[PDB]
Design an enzyme around this catalytic site. Sequence first.
Site, mmCIF file in Angstrom:
data_model
loop_
_atom_site.group_PDB
_atom_site.id
_atom_site.type_symbol
_atom_site.label_atom_id
_atom_site.label_comp_id
_atom_site.label_asym_id
_atom_site.label_seq_id
_atom_site.Cartn_x
_atom_site.Cartn_y
_atom_site.Cartn_z
ATOM 1 N N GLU A 118 24.138 -18.083 -14.826
ATOM 2 C CA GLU A 118 22.966 -17.613 -13.855
ATOM 3 C C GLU A 118 21.962 -18.851 -14.387
ATOM 4 O O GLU A 118 21.655 -19.227 -13.190
ATOM 5 C CB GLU A 118 22.235 -16.730 -13.201
ATOM 6 N N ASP A 127 21.234 -23.187 -1.620
ATOM 7 C CA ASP A 127 22.521 -23.183 -2.674
ATOM 8 C C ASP A 127 23.416 -23.349 -1.545
ATOM 9 O O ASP A 127 23.638 -23.651 -0.442
ATOM 10 C CB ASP A 127 22.752 -22.422 -3.166
#
Length: 423
Positions: A118, A127
């Site tokens: 991550e 994102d």
Amino acid sequence: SPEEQLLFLYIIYTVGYALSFSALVIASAILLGFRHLHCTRNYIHLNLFASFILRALCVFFKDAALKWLSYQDSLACRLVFLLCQYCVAANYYWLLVEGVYLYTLLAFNIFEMLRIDEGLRLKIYKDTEGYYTIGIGHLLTKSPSLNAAKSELDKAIGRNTNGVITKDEAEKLFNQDVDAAVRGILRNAKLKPVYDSLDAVRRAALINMVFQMGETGVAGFTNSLRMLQQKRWDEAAVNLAKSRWYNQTPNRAKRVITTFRTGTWDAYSEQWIFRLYVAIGWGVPLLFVVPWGIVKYLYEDEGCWTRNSNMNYWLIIRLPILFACIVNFLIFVRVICIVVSKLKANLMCKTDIAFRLAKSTLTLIPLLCTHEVIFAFVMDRFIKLFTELSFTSFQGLMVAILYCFVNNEVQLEFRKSWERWRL
Ligand SMILES: CS(=O)(=O)c1cccc(NC(=O)N(Cc2ccc(C(=O)Nc3nnn[nH]3)cc2)c2ccc(C3CCCCC3)cc2)c1
């Protein structure tokens, strides 16, 4: 009788290396032979067995070359004795990386798995899907509004965000998400039975998927979660490759699927780390054994260097082995504090490869390195002292028993191949 006493001690020494050599060649053949045993933990054991096999080979050659200028005066003996002392140093350094690996194996967990996959964010980022993420994979809302994303994060962290969030604040919210990931699994009727059947290492692989997709998302793998509970790893491994998740994020999936298939952290391991272990086990001994060999040949050369009583030329082979034992007992003490901490906190069961490996590695450290520490600066009752020869001979057998014959994973490979013969 003087002849019978000298002969009996020869038998328990030669049958010692005979039972060791045999069990070590069998143990090494098992680790190489079975495909599912090809992992870093077992490759480290093979290099440790190799140093005990070549030590036995020096013992059998010395005994065989006694069959006819005497053998003590020959240069060939001195080379065999140098190769013997190289194997002794290699035993204590392949025992060192054995303890080093164990310690790093206890330190790696889900929080270090997800920190690699991550990553880390300092500021709020929009994102690719439309979600605003920050820290270690912490998604907020899909709503296209940075003003509302900052006000949503402010309620979750406490103080005013502004945009920049420090390392300590991200780790605090990261522990919350992982706790929210495990409660989701246990609250899900299709994820709790497979999670409770999975080991701590493959459990983290299941948590990693929930952390990326979600409890309701990974529950869709009804075909894959069933064969994970039935202990069919490789059948589930090729099944997860034929998924929406593997084509979406392949590099992350390849690492998670390998953890379900193998049950180790090798997909999160670096290839140069094992190159640094082979440089410790075989390389470091080469740095002090050859100068010892050079100074004994040029100065104390007398009967395959038996008369080892002159100067500091004795310390240039005993201090590096003593150093390997001092650090092995430091690792021994620290790992015992880690294992007892993780057991009481319920972060480890006695059925995990980290606890099983601790039951074997923590046995061999005070079994092979205790003598070197007790008689640290002593060079040289004789019948009772000659019993040292039995523990030096059968120690090769003990390494084979603890790292292969008592291993639960190899017993599965024998029970599985046995059933394959019938069906
Ligand atoms: C607190 S602790 O419990 O963490 C721990 C710490 C340090 C040493 C030990 N010593 C030990 O447990 N034993 C018995 C034993 C039980 C199970 C296994 C095993 O299943 N190993 C394995 N499975 N899969 N892979 N490896 C291996 C060994 C032990 C004790 C003494 C000896 C010697 C006694 C004198 C004669 C030579 C042997 C050997 C083993 C436990």
